[PDB]
Design a protein around this ligand. Sequence first.
Ligand code: HEM
Ligand code: HEM
Ligand SMILES: *N[C@@H](Cc1ccccc1)C(=O)O
Ligand SMILES: *N[C@@H](Cc1ccccc1)C(=O)O
Ligand SMILES: *N[C@@H](Cc1ccccc1)C(=O)O
Ligand SMILES: *N[C@@H](Cc1ccccc1)C(=O)O
Lengths: 448, 447
Amino acid sequence: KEMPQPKTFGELKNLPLLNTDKPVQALMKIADELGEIFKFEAPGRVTRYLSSQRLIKEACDESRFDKNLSQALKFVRDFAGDGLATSWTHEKNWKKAHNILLPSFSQQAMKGYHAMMVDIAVQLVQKWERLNADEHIEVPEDMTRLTLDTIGLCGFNYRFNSFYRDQPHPFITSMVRALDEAMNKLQRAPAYDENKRQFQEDIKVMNDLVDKIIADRKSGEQSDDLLTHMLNGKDPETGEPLDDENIRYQIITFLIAGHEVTSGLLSFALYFLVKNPHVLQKAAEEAARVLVDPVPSYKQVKQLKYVGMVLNEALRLWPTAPAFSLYAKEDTVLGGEYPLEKGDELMVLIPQLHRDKTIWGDDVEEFRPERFENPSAIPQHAFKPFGNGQRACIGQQFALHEATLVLGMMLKHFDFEDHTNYELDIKETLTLKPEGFVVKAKSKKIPL
Amino acid sequence: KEMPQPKTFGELKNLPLLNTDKPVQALMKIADELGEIFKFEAPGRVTRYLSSQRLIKEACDESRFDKNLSQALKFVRDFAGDGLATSWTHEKNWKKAHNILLPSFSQQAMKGYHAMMVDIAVQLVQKWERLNADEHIEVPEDMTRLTLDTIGLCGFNYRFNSFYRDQPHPFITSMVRALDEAMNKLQRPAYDENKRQFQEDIKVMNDLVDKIIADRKSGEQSDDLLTHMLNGKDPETGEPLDDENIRYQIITFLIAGHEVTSGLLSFALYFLVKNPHVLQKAAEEAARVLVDPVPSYKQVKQLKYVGMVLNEALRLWPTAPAFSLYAKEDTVLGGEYPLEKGDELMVLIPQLHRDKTIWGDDVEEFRPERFENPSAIPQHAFKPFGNGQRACIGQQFALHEATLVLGMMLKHFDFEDHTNYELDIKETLTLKPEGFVVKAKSKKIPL
Ligand code: HEM
Ligand code: HEM
Ligand SMILES: *N[C@@H](Cc1ccccc1)C(=O)O
Ligand SMILES: *N[C@@H](Cc1ccccc1)C(=O)O
Ligand SMILES: *N[C@@H](Cc1ccccc1)C(=O)O
Ligand SMILES: *N[C@@H](Cc1ccccc1)C(=O)O
């Protein structure tokens, strides 16, 4: 009944614990000492970090808990607005955009996005086959190039052409810097006057590009992208279409939730593959037996079951969206021993949930894709890499299909060597990525 | 591209080849002569028996192949009904019962069954320590007593009390006889008596099970499969299983439980006493882990090598020796065998597990160390529990029960193959080593 709490720092309480370049991993270490739940206190804020399936399965009860905007999401809201990810459930614009955007994110809608995904996937395979001998691949940098171009091509029919650059796009320079400042606000309290001047200067860069792209599209030209469905799609409930401001926030949202959070999955997947040669060969075998054409089809991607198992296990150990927030709708008791008042907040520490030994056994730290041989064997609310309930990831099928195609083509065309014996170092922005992860790719000389 | 086929018998085609008391072993011998695939033809039926991991990994593609009811499963359906094992994937009651029964068969649900499994496991250990000198154990008969009592106690809180009997329960008297008739119809006024007895055997099973369902509905609750089915509702449709289907699930769980699982223990003990080094390695682990008079659920999960012994025994002699599949659409198998929509396939599991390209040249050797790393095992090479969504739902149940009991057996007894048993596999719908007997000299470790 008495909830533990980590070390305090006087008037700042537990806030200095977040003053670190790896906060998610720090909360994971705190969870190992304190267990399934611990109270976290800051000046003006209190939250409870959940780590066990026993309690998270209760927090996922939508009749008792709703999505809360964490302090990180409130800072992203300053440029993501009332987009799908940074809006409240009770706000009119969430349910409106949710109803309009569900058909464009279905598994059957991935058939229309497949050709543009293959476009960017071919550019990645061609870059790696044009490398010289002893040259290495910067894995997270190249995965971000692919993911960002994929969502740009599939979402707005816009080509960032990341494979033609070493310096990033002027849009994401402002974006990644706005995400950095938003994360740096997490552990605060004239000195930061420059930060604020740069923050609004970075917000205007994102708004002007998207609003110009929206105004340019509105030629009347159609396409198979997210952009067309938002100009002509109407919410069945209210009958209304999204206004011009909201569509801008959705595009910014899809670009953030697109590029490196999805690429982190590919980077972690490739890392765990080259660290487990048995799994690598088994996944490479499936890529060769299934992808029999120079260009993979939509059906062939769906046949890569073991590649999806590899992607699901990489999401287990290192989910790139490492947590989400919930608040109590009413007075309730959590786990029969932790009474919660209305409005009290919860945190779902996803990497810890996926390390519940009572769910996955003693071998939680091993990269074993065979845990996902049969999805019905996994308990309820034990695997939550994409959120929960109606507030779950709407682009889950987008990210999984894109990652399955690219990983299958990567395993089909290249042998991969961990030439540096990479020591895992997880860089923490708002997401997780293996910093400095490099590999060598000996081509298999299979043409496209 | 041209598919081989064994010898034919005129208008009967290959059917007389099945007129034998060991058809699975006979089909295994045909695979050794004909290879990874051969056509099998009967009047009104044709199927293709797959034997290699190369082709079976394709047959396991659920987007291209679905579970088919083999001619044996069609005959079992006359009393197993639309239960989980004898229903088609498209029948509404399969997915309905599948959704309702998945949580009750989870690995976390084995914690609730553990105490009742230890109850029957202790009765087995006490019977064996109460034997007199020079008395031997009838291994498959005693393993069947344990597995039948386990599923009855864990599934319906009913005690068959098999260790208090010499003649089996009247329910399974009709059940084993109905399985005999169902298998003998496969290779068959002359049989008029069989049908009269067959309907008499079905009525005995239906009336008994329906009485237990009506008796439970006392209002009493429990941690058994029966309670999970009376109060559980399918999340998809919102509906609960009706009473006729619940009867079929209980009949299903009684068949698919005891004698398929008891074969695993009998084969496991056989392979243990034929390989004393493996026997000693597993007996050492049982002593190293089971430090309590009663094993806990946590301790069973730590019997890693015992599980390898159980997995290797399932490799050589899987007790559910095959399953059936049909092509959902026109497809090509292996790039050389074109199949039309609806064409049937057979997965000869004991042959699949003897693929030298997967397990090496020592396929016939009992090496439990093959399963040290499941990621080292190729895809769809080890299929003792079926495939995909139609896989064994009691997989958990059977492995935990067999690991607990086998661990207690190795901890409490030294085992001697006093007759130097010659393996003789009796074939009903499953496989078991007939006449396998051993001596168990107790270690005098109390409970
Ligand atoms: C590996 C890839 C991804 C992971 C692990 C992931 C994870 C998540 C998680 C955990 C949430 C819940 C956030 C919360 O509850 O506060 C979420 C929501 C969301 N994600 Fe993703 N995501 C991924 C890729 C994508 C992609 C490709 C898109 C493309 C548009 C996307 C767009 C969104 C949106 C719009 C939401 C908010 C949905 C709503 O609340 O209505 N994400 N994601
Ligand atoms: C050594 C023990 C066991 C083995 C080798 C085994 C094997 C199998 C196999 C191969 C199948 C697939 C049948 C097919 O595809 O046509 C299956 C299905 C099934 N088994 Fe088992 N089994 C065992 C124990 C059990 C136990 C203890 C139960 C307890 C209820 C059980 C219940 C079932 C059920 C209900 C199905 C049908 C599942 C479905 O299709 O939805 N089995 N089993
Ligand atoms: N996103 C999680 C973890 C986190 C804590 C502190 C800084 C960054 C990320 C949360 O907000 O609690
Ligand atoms: N990830 C958490 C971290 C945090 C906790 C408490 C105060 C500030 C930040 C979050 O999203 O807020
Ligand atoms: N269950 C297998 C093997 C078998 C063949 C003939 C009679 C009994 C069992 C199958 O049905 O093909
Ligand atoms: N076990 C098989 C045996 C069989 C195959 C082909 C024709 C007749 C019988 C089965 O259950 O069908």
